[PDB]
Each structure stands twice: as C-alpha cells, then as structure tokens.
Design a protein around this ligand. Structure first.
Ligand SMILES: N#Cc1cc2c(cc1C(F)(C(F)(F)F)C(F)(F)F)CC[C@H]1N(C(=O)[C@H]3CC[C@H](C(=O)O)CC3)CC[C@@]21S(=O)(=O)c1ccc(F)cc1
Length: 253
C-alpha cells in the first residue's frame, strides 16, 4: 500500500495543514526578536500573584491547544477515526504538540520566549512557583533549536507526535497504526530527500515529552489544591477538561 507519489502528496498536505493552523507566523516571531521586556516589566510579572499568572498562562495554553485541535481536524485520516480515538489522541498529544511548536517562539541567542507581545526569559514566570518545570520547558526549546528545524520538518514531526498508535485507550489500534506508518514514511522520505536524516538520532526521546506533560499535570494539581475556586471560576473549560464536553463540540464543528 501507498506509492512514492502518494507519500509526497501526504508530505504536502501535512505541511499545508500545519501552515494553516499556526497561531503565530514564524516571520512575525522573528521580526519581534528585538522587542524584549524591560527590567521594570519583568519585575511587574514577578510581582503578580501566583493565581493571576497561572490564569494568564492557562489562557495562552488553551488558545494554542485550539490551533492544535484544528491541525488534527485538517490532518489526513484523523476525522476518519472514531470520536473516542480522536479524543484519546488529542488528550495525550495536544500539549506535546504545543511543547514542540513552542520552539518557534523561542530565541536561543538570549534564551527568551515570546509572551504577551514581547520576549522574556525564564525569570518572567517566577510567580508561577514552577521554576523546575519552567527550566525543563526552556531546556526542551533550547534542545529543539539546536536542530534548526524547517517549518516542514516541524509539520511532519508534530503530526507524528499526535498520531501515536501506542496511546492507551484506542479502540481501533490498527487504523491509527496504519496512519502513523504513512506519516512515518512521509517524514523519513522528506528527511532523505532533503539530506536531513542526521536529525533522527537527535530527536528527543518519547519519554521526554511524556515527562514534561506529567510535570505540568503535577504542578496544576498542587495549584488547584491551594486555589480550587480560582480554577473553577477563572480557568478555561477546555484547559480543565484536558489537565484537571468541549473537545466533542470542537471536533463536531
Ligand atoms: N498554562 C500554561 C502554559 C502555557 C504555555 C507554556 C507552558 C505553560 C505551563 F502551564 C506548563 F509549563 F506547565 F506547561 C506553565 F508554565 F505555565 F506552567 C509553554 C508554551 C507556551 N506557548 C507558546 O509558546 C506558543 C505555542 C504555539 C505556537 C504556535 O502555534 O505558533 C506559538 C507559541 C503557548 C502558551 C505557553 S506561554 O506563552 O503562556 C508560556 C508560559 C510558560 C513558559 F515557560 C513559556 C511560555
């Protein structure tokens, strides 16, 4: 099954689907690299209350997950799967996809990330009381930056992050296995064609993305225990559903 011309067609539709569902244009993120938060602005973020910062971050994460849901809906084969499998894949992989896409908003030259209009370092997020998780996320973005990914490479890699046939809870394992295999062929074909197969050994282990998501859920549980009414009243419904239905509505649309 699937010939060379069909593999190349898959590469291009995956790249198109990714281009259409990016929250931020890479050119826009690059043109803003000089717009950095001043010492006073950083101090203002640090002085914000823990709950205020958590709410802002969960709001920005919910917006980014919404673009990832749209990427999945445009991904060839995803809407053909059953609703249980579409939801199992989004619950386990949407945050992993946001974690990979985030490297585009990262600047390795000064170790800053784009956040609310400007670039700021790790210290911008000190009010979260997450410094170990923040460090891991900045290290993961730093390690993806060292690979110099093209946009097409991130498109093929993130499709594979999402279409993972090993996720527990899949009712039609074989249909997801088939789609994962076609996407693997498309990614390796594109790497072979562009002389970029050397990145294969340098891609992060799958346990690394799993560990970052687990840490996110653990720090959220700590925060929700101390501020349960804040989570209930001011956190986005889609965020609580994924990390603490909305997904069923987004997938029907
Ligand atoms: N709620 C949140 C939350 C939200 C986000 C991240 C982490 C968390 C946590 F939770 C954590 F770490 F636990 F996961 C944190 F840190 F707050 F605790 C990392 C990805 C980031 N992000 C992006 O950089 C986007 C991704 C999509 C991309 C595109 O589609 O083009 C544009 C850039 C989405 C939200 C955002 S953020 O900007 O609020 C931000 C927050 C902390 C940080 F260390 C760096 C950035």
């Amino acid at each position: 099954m699937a010939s060379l011309t069909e593999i190349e067609h898959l590469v291009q539709s995956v790249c198109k689907s990714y281009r259409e569902t990016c929250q931020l244009r890479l050119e826009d993120l690059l043109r803003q690299r000089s717009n950095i938060f001043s010492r006073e602005e950083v101090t203002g973020y640090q002085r914000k209350s823990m709950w205020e910062m958590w709410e802002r971050c969960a709001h920005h994460l919910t917006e980014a997950i919404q673009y990832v849901v749209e990427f999945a809906k445009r991904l060839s084969g995803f809407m053909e799967l059953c609703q249980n499998d579409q939801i199992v894949l989004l619950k386990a992989g949407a945050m992993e996809v946001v974690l990979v896409r985030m490297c585009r908003a990262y600047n390795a030259d000064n170790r800053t990330v784009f956040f609310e209009g400007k670039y700021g370092g790790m210290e911008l997020f000190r009010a979260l009381g997450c410094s170990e998780l923040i460090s891991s996320i900045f290290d993961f973005s730093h390690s993806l930056s060292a690979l110099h990914f093209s946009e097409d490479e991130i498109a093929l890699y993130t499709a594979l992050v999402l279409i993972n046939a090993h996720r527990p809870g899949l009712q039609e394992k074989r249909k997801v296995e088939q789609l994962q295999y076609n996407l693997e062929l498309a990614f390796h074909h594109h790497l072979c064609k562009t002389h970029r197969q050397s990145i294969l050994a340098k891609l992060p282990p799958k346990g690394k993305l799993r560990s970052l998501c687990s840490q996110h859920v653990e720090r959220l549980q700590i925060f929700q225990h101390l501020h349960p009414i804040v989570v209930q009243a001011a956190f986005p419904p889609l965020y609580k559903e994924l990390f603490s239905k909305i997904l069923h509505r987004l997938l029907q649309e």
